[PDB]
Amino acid sequence: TGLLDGKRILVSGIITDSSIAFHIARVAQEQGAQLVLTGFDRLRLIQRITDRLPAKAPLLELDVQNEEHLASLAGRVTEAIGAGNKLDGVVHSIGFMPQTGMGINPFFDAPYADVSKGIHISAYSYASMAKALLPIMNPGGSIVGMDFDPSRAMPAYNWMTVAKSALESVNRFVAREAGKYGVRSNLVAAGPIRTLAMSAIVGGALGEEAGAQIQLLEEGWDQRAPIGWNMKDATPVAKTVCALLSDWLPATTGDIIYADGGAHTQLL
Amino acid sequence: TGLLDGKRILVSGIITDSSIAFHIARVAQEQGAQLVLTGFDRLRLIQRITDRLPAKAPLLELDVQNEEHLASLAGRVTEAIGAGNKLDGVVHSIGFMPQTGMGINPFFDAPYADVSKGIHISAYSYASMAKALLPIMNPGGSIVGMDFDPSRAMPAYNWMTVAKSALESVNRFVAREAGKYGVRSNLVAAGPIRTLAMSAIVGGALGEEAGAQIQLLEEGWDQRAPIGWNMKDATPVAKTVCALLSDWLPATTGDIIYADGGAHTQLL
Amino acid sequence: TGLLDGKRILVSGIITDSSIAFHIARVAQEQGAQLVLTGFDRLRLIQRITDRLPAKAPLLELDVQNEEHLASLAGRVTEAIGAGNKLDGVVHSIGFMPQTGMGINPFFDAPYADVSKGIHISAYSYASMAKALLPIMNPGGSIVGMDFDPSRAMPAYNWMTVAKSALESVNRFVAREAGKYGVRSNLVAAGPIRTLAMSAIVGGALGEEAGAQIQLLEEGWDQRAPIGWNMKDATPVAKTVCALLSDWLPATTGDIIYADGGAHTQLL
Amino acid sequence: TGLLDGKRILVSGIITDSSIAFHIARVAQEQGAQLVLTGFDRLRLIQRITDRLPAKAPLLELDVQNEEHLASLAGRVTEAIGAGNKLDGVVHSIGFMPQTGMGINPFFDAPYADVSKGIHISAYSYASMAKALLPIMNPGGSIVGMDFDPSRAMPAYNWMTVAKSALESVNRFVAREAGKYGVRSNLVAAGPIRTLAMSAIVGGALGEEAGAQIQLLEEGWDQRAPIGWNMKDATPVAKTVCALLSDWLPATTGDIIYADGGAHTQLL
Numbered sequence A, B, C, D: 001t002g003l004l005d006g007k008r009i010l011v012s013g014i015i016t017d018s019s020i021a022f023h024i025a026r027v028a029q030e031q032g033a034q035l036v037l038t039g040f041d042r043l044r045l046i047q048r049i050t051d052r053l054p055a056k057a058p059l060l061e062l063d064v065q066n067e068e069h070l071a072s073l074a075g076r077v078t079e080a081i082g083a084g085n086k087l088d089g090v091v092h093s094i095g096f097m098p099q100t101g102m103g104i105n106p107f108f109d110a111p112y113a114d115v116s117k118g119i120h121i122s123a124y125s126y127a128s129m130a131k132a133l134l135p136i137m138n139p140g141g142s143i144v145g146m147d148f149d150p151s152r153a154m155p156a157y158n159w160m161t162v163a164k165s166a167l168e169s170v171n172r173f174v175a176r177e178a179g180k181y182g183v184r185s186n187l188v189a190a191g192p193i194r195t196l197a198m199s200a201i202v203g204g205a206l207g208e209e210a211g212a213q214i215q216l217l218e219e220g221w222d223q224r225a226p227i228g229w230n231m232k233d234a235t236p237v238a239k240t241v242c243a244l245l246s247d248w249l250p251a252t253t254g255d256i257i258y259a260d261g262g263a264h265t266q267l268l
């Protein structure tokens, strides 16, 4: 009698046990969902990490820049879940921007090849995944992607914020296509989460100034949030994704749900 | 094992069996919630209407313009739910604007006394209710109000749209206060719902031109909505309110969730 | 050969030489406009203040809560500018909220009578003025009101922020009506300006906590603004209003132009 | 005594006499500006077109995808305007998306190589141009780019709308960098303009369905616009760009000014 009882849901984006997608997968299993996982490049690592989830789940390789992987994806999922069965949910929790497009490297100094790779992985791939998977989704289904509010510019995030602006636009178009299948498409805009990479950035991995700036941004977030914000806890974010994967928001599509403590609704 | 098992929730705004609040109450009871209802003025009528809900619920009188009603409200609720028990949820589903502030009466011709009454009932009362009820709400609790997207002007809605703009602002402030109690505050922006009053307006009760305009607005809404919009079905709206009343969006406050078929995310 | 050569423009809202409207009037006269001024209550004071403008201008009494003043206003303006002449511009620079609706008085403690008076003066009056003056405006004309960005809640501003949210909504409706006359309606959202009242508030006139909060808000504004923000200089704001009064933004209506140093476009 | 007297302004984007940039250049010259023009690929054609402007202007070659052109650009401009002189204004009026990313080709069928080229030319190039030209701009200067409101998805525009979403994000970052030079960065969001390409699209050049959809969008725009919208007249758009190039909006940066008849502020 979980929120997601009987649902078959694909979850991309697990790389470590601090990945937002690891917590999305954990909560969805706690709520009765049957998962198929996708991983990029380091499949041995990802299998070992995902062994710590409450239930075993098949793991498929998916590099979103690889056209072959995308073309075979629905067939591979169908074999993992059994012929005649379809998915009820898809989670996109994939993002990347080269170091030249984030941190202390000046905004104007990111070469376009680097920005293009970041926008491919972070924004275009949301459409790629929907194209691949809508033919094997049931009516009433739900596609969810991870967003970080790009409405205002911020220090250090730089071209990653541009990629999120493109992602929000992509989501509105995916909703139009997904609608033909009786399927919803939405993003969850999360507050900052202390993943391994984010901890490294605050520790100065992309320059001292960028680290300082991101730390300040984190502190302001909790201060602004009327219910507070705990950057070490991805669970409220994971629960929000599961809310969208459920049947409890059946008239919301092309949209953005903010799991940020309410910080974006306050100026100070 | 419902979504709202064990929760005690106050629901205002029932006047007929087509009231959005009637469907909110029905769905919340189907999901295990124990309700306290509030009604305005025609309490005999409201009791008879609410007899059709799946479970019996105490009905309290509440005129949001009446300071005495608001001052006694927490005590009356506490006696209905039993001393030592508190509310987990509050639903504001209250709206009013005099006929001079809607329909074919020119926008410039609404007297301020009429606009003020409409803003009192439709916007200020969201703060009034929160003031009255936060002292008897549990941590983890949720306050939800009903909104109609006022970001762009529209024909006929006129000063009611202005009241909704004020309501959205009020909600962001209520979230700051509610946060001190561990309580969330959010609005659900619904698409148009064919309540008795809305059917009457399309039938020309506020002038022929206003009727025509609202009919066109309804038709465009379903056309824009990537998953469609059924104005005769309040259930998707009710489910969305219950989503916010649950523990599944624990990091969303001061915010607006759109239960509109995705229509606001599309231009045509 | 000024920006506003040959234009006849009404300017409300002068009370001291630090009033934003004083600087709007000064810049418009420097740019060739012929003004009619309106003042509330302390007409002797206002006449003495306005004697410091570059050119003499007729001063008319206007209490926006007074129905008689509003009904006679067009006739009084026509006699000041001469029969057969019409206005090309109207400036609304009027705002008020009782002390119970701003500062350290808790948000929930503002009585509705006080909030209603504030919304009357600050929001409804924008429509009142347009109703009164559109019949004596020329095609190509411009109505401009003063706004403070209410998209996010902030400390101390409280019900004044709610009034601004209502004002933004009112402006979109006024644009629909003004359009019938070939007239534009827009708001200028200014950054914080150190008027006499604002200096007093920072000095603690509405409580110490509110003062502290507003000071912090001012400091953050200049820090966020990519071109900086000088709260002691109303001239950039005045120039922006004159831009809207000119023929140089002829396809902008129902809209908001931000004269805030770009602060609202940045998170930190 | 024009609006732009004494200013030196670079204008990109002229290809035909229906180019929005042709009208921007014409109005800026009528207002006293001294121009430097940039053109892509068909320089013989562009020279002949630009011979119809009120004043002669030097024409420089600029392919925004060509790193060499961008690296030599400031030097070439300096030789055209004379050593010791700098620019006061820069106009980006450059946009492109391959046919696979617009029209009736399904959204999911645009290959990433095509989308990437479109985002390079339409969004990244706004940053490229600013990088190249800020070192030769005067304090008080202004960078302006052309936008089409991408806040909601629309039929046929598809990946071009995604590129505009990215452009709006880029503009907020460019404003931060431009601020260091005392320079503003803003976009003008225009309503639809019947350029040669747009006429061709309505005539069915990108498929019949896409043509039909764009025609409907155009008709709705004028209907929504409180002051109307004339798609055959680029002059109101050009005047708006010149407003931003002037000293009359000195506190607006990282922002978007809508020259759309007010259509985006209205639902119907």
Ligand SMILES: NC(=O)c1ccc[n+]([C@@H]2O[C@H](COP(=O)([O-])OP(=O)(O)OC[C@H]3O[C@@H](n4cnc5c(N)ncnc54)[C@H](O)[C@@H]3O)[C@@H](O)[C@H]2O)c1
Binding pocket: A012, A013, A014, A015, A016, A018, A019, A020, A021, A039, A040, A062, A063, A064, A065, A092, A093, A094, A095, A096, A121, A146, A147, A148, A189, A190, A191, A192, A193, A194, A195, A197, A198
């Ligand atoms: N951490 C934050 O503060 C935060 C805040 C809001 C949103 N988000 C977003 O949440 C999502 C998940 O990120 P995270 O913070 O959990 O970091 P993470 O590093 O744990 O996850 C990012 C994932 O992207 C995957 N990925 C990268 N390139 C790929 C490719 N070519 N094909 C397939 N997958 C690829 C990685 O393998 C990894 O699993 C991202 O979209 C991120 O932008 C993060």
Ligand SMILES: NC(=O)c1ccc[n+]([C@@H]2O[C@H](COP(=O)([O-])OP(=O)(O)OC[C@H]3O[C@@H](n4cnc5c(N)ncnc54)[C@H](O)[C@@H]3O)[C@@H](O)[C@H]2O)c1
Binding pocket: B012, B013, B014, B015, B016, B018, B019, B020, B021, B039, B040, B062, B063, B064, B065, B092, B093, B094, B095, B096, B121, B146, B147, B148, B189, B190, B191, B192, B193, B194, B195, B197, B198
């Ligand atoms: N029907 C729609 O199309 C639509 C769309 C979006 C949002 N909404 C909103 O949903 C809410 C519920 O409205 P509805 O459409 O279900 O109509 P309704 O007429 O069924 O409900 C409105 C309720 O407001 C109550 N009310 C009026 N004055 C009151 C007072 N002084 N004190 C206490 N209660 C008072 C009425 O008694 C009634 O129960 C309103 O906020 C409305 O604006 C409606």
Ligand SMILES: NC(=O)c1ccc[n+]([C@@H]2O[C@H](COP(=O)([O-])OP(=O)(O)OC[C@H]3O[C@@H](n4cnc5c(N)ncnc54)[C@H](O)[C@@H]3O)[C@@H](O)[C@H]2O)c1
Binding pocket: C012, C013, C014, C015, C016, C018, C019, C020, C021, C039, C040, C062, C063, C064, C065, C092, C093, C094, C095, C096, C121, C146, C147, C148, C189, C190, C191, C192, C193, C194, C195, C197, C198
């Ligand atoms: N000062 C700021 O930081 C700031 C920032 C953004 C916007 N604004 C807005 O600019 C406008 C002008 O305010 P200001 O800051 O220059 O302060 P101000 O006190 O100098 O001007 C306010 C004016 O409102 C007038 N007014 C009050 N009640 C009235 C009534 N019943 N009828 C007619 N006029 C009445 C007052 O006489 C006064 O002239 C207001 O709308 C204000 O909200 C101010």
Ligand SMILES: NC(=O)c1ccc[n+]([C@@H]2O[C@H](COP(=O)([O-])OP(=O)(O)OC[C@H]3O[C@@H](n4cnc5c(N)ncnc54)[C@H](O)[C@@H]3O)[C@@H](O)[C@H]2O)c1
Binding pocket: D012, D013, D014, D015, D016, D018, D019, D020, D021, D039, D040, D062, D063, D064, D065, D092, D093, D094, D095, D096, D121, D146, D147, D148, D189, D190, D191, D192, D193, D194, D195, D197, D198
């Ligand atoms: N026409 C509309 O309805 C409309 C509406 C809003 C905004 N806009 C925008 O206005 C701008 C101007 O477009 P237009 O409608 O005047 O069309 P246009 O075809 O006349 O102008 C587009 C220009 O982009 C230039 N360009 C293309 N690739 C280039 C490259 N690699 N390097 C340099 N320049 C290149 C072309 O040479 C051409 O001069 C674009 O940003 C467009 O998106 C157009």
Ligand SMILES: Cc1cc(C)nc(SCCO)n1
Binding pocket: A094, A095, A096, A097, A148, A160, A195, A197, A198, A201
């Ligand atoms: C919003 C945001 C922040 C960070 C550090 N990474 C990402 S995606 C790269 C994952 O480590 N997205």
Ligand SMILES: Cc1cc(C)nc(SCCO)n1
Binding pocket: B094, B095, B096, B097, B148, B160, B195, B197, B198, B201
């Ligand atoms: C958005 C909206 C529309 C209507 C007709 N009424 C309301 S409240 C009055 C209830 O019948 N709100």
Ligand SMILES: Cc1cc(C)nc(SCCO)n1
Binding pocket: C094, C095, C096, C097, C148, C160, C195, C197, C198, C201
């Ligand atoms: C935004 C804002 C701030 C303040 C102090 N007053 C106002 S109107 C009252 C004028 O002194 N408006």
Ligand SMILES: Cc1cc(C)nc(SCCO)n1
Binding pocket: D094, D095, D096, D097, D148, D160, D195, D197, D198, D201
């Ligand atoms: C918004 C928009 C529409 C169109 C047809 N083209 C462009 S850029 C290509 C120029 O002909 N931008």
Ligand SMILES: [Mg+2]
Binding pocket: A051, A052, A053
């Ligand atoms: Mg294990």
Ligand SMILES: [Mg+2]
Binding pocket: B051, B052, B053
């Ligand atoms: Mg019964």
Ligand SMILES: [Mg+2]
Binding pocket: C051, C052, C053
């Ligand atoms: Mg004098």
Ligand SMILES: [Mg+2]
Binding pocket: D051, D052, D053
């Ligand atoms: Mg010639």
